[PDB]
Amino acid sequence: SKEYHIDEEVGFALPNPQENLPDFYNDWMFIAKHLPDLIESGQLRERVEKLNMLSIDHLTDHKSQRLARLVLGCITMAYVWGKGHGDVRKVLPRNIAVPYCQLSKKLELPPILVYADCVLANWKKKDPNKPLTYENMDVLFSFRDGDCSKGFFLVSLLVEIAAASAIKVIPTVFKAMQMQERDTLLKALLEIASCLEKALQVFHQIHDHVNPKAFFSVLRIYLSGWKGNPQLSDGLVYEGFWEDPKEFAGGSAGQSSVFQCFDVLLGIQQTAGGGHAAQFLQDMRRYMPPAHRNFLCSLESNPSVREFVLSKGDAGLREAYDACVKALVSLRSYHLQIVTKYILIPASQQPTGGTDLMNFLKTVRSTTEKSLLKEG
Ligand code: HEM
């Protein structure tokens, strides 16, 4: 899946991202590099305001334009939120806004830090000989110290990598169906299930490397966007680029292609019925890179694995299919427990919004659970 920007090892994640830019953009790198202490001192907003209006013409390859998006994205957040106490900026300087809006228009990603920036491009191997594990990995950027950004951004990425083991099997599934190869398909569906079962254990690591109170109070506010945010009721104005303010949602893991990829594969019609859940998951594809957005297209336009499996009156083929759907439920069911610990409880500790966040996630899980065949 080379044309779709899918890697065999790390899937949707950027295979090995650049850690620095061409020297013409040293102004940018310095602010991004030293955010944690630039925020504490009132410098940051000054250091952004007095800055050159650099052009994006000296960004040659993809990995250059992505690190640019990450750097600009990370800075744009810290500017708008500051120390993160309700001290906000309602306007972005044209010195940083224009290059970010042009570079964003270029990659077809919106002008705001997305999952593709702060998880998929925001990582490196410490020792390139030892494998991909929290031990031997570090993010390129943070917001503060003790924001637990390393934990969230890397455990997210490690789940993207766990999913890669299943995502690379997908072409075997479609080959097998067309070539009426039952035995090949059963293994490939059992293989996908097995890899999604592994991805669940990877999810447990979040308890080890992320602190609820720190996460909820610190990192969550920088990852916060400006769609339906009363802090910025009419969104944010990108000075000189857009006439009037624009609204764009924050950098959630809900911009991940992993879960949406296997919903489409298994014929789980999430983005049908025209509910809030369906409308949310459809909107999040705007915040995915255009290559991945096209990949979920290809999956949709292929013949249904679901309606194929049901035809054959084959118990083995149904069980293998179910195993993939159960694996996907288990992941969503566990993710609800995570949100309970990391959103709901924290939000009740500090002096019905969280009630229908849980309804959104439970809707999406229930839609998945309804696709189970149960040998019928
Ligand atoms: C402390 C950890 C986490 C918290 C607090 C958290 C919180 C949330 C919340 C509140 C949502 C609802 C959508 C939104 O508000 O934008 C969401 C959605 C989502 N999260 Fe997470 N999340 C966490 C970890 C993860 C991880 C590690 C993954 C791995 C891929 C993940 C994948 C998703 C996906 C795919 C959605 C979209 C809805 C769905 O398809 O079920 N989350 N998350």
Ligand SMILES: N[C@@H](Cc1c[nH]c2ccccc12)C(=O)O
């Ligand atoms: N997408 C949210 C931000 C958000 C909600 N829940 C999250 C969990 C993790 C990270 C970010 C978030 C916004 O509009 O601003």
